Design a protein around this ligand. Structure first.
Ligand SMILES: OC[C@H]1O[C@@H](O[C@H]2[C@H](O)[C@@H](O)[C@@H](O)O[C@@H]2CO)[C@H](O)[C@@H](O)[C@H]1O
Length: 281
């Protein structure tokens, strides 16, 4: 869990996520944003056997979840490695969720005050309000997400199935049509994703490996790893790697941005034409 970037959401309301409020040190419980305001790096300390929870805020990069003793308020404060900035991550095996207990006083644990939309420090109990879902942020963002996929080279255009009956995949200006939207679904067993085109019921983005680099939408088929993909952030831009051959990534032909440009797979080569934005419509 060390060094992992996660989202943290509430068992009591799974639509509410820990959110670092811009402009101040506040932490709120907020709807899912799929951005850095709801991402936290888990940092393990060997001496304490406890963790810091550090905001991925790009403007102030060293804020950590902090109990503002002697109050019961929780905010994001500059990291000084203080005891009130360390937490025990206790996984309830009977609920598959976490209790997050203060290292400074482990009798007190995070409590989701869903009415106040913030966190307080509390005693333990059997309520869902002290239980949290900690998930890798890419899985959190993309495990069940209807999206548009755009090349970083042309933000106003999208990867699309050509039409309901033409299963080729190309680039075209965004028009909010069904064939231009995809539902990403994470498969836990395979630890990979499928992209279901919204104009079909069972059509997924597929590498047609029998035809070179071709990508088409095809019916989801039991045993075809070419229909699964890995989504990796670029060291919110992503490469999209095929599971059948992880040297092959989704590729905008020649970095061309004209309407009709081919979407395919290609050898991974670090080009801007292999980097993608994945966004809400
Ligand atoms: O399958 C097409 C590949 O094109 C490569 O870019 C070429 C481009 O097609 C060519 O016209 C010229 O500009 O040289 C480029 C290489 O630097 C992409 O690099 C590749 O990823 C594929 O898209």
């Amino acid at each position: 869990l060390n060094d992992k970037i996660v989202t943290i959401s509430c068992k009591a309301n799974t639509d509410l996520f820990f959110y670092q409020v811009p402009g101040n040190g506040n932490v709120s419980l907020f709807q899912q944003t799929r951005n850095y305001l709801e991402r936290w790096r888990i940092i393990y300390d060997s001496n304490k056997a406890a963790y810091k929870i550090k905001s991925m805020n790009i403007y102030n990069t060293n804020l950590v979840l902090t109990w503002n003793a002697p109050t019961h308020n929780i905010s994001a404060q500059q990291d000084s490695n203080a005891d009130n900035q360390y937490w025990l991550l206790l996984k309830d095996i009977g609920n598959n969720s976490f209790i997050i207990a203060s290292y400074k006083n482990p009798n007190l644990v995070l409590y989701a005050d869903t009415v106040a939309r913030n966190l307080k420090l509390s005693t333990l109990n059997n309520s869902s309000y002290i239980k949290f879902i900690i998930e890798d942020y890419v899985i959190s963002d993309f495990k069940n997400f209807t999206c548009r996929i755009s090349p970083i080279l042309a933000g106003g255009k999208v990867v699309q199935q050509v039409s309901m009956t033409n299963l080729a995949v190309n680039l075209y200006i965004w028009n909010n049509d069904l064939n231009q939207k995809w539902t990403i679904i994470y498969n836990e067993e395979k630890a990979a994703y499928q992209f279901f085109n919204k104009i079909l019921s069972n059509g997924v983005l597929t590498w047609i490996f029998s035809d070179g680099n071709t990508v088409r939408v095809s019916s989801s088929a039991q045993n075809n790893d070419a229909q699964y993909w890995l989504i990796n952030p670029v060291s919110d831009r992503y490469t999209i790697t095929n599971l059948r051959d992880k040297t092959k990534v989704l590729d905008l032909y020649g970095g061309q941005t004209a309407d009709g440009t081919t979407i395919q797979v290609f050898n991974s080569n670090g080009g801007d034409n292999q980097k993608w934005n994945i966004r809400n419509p």
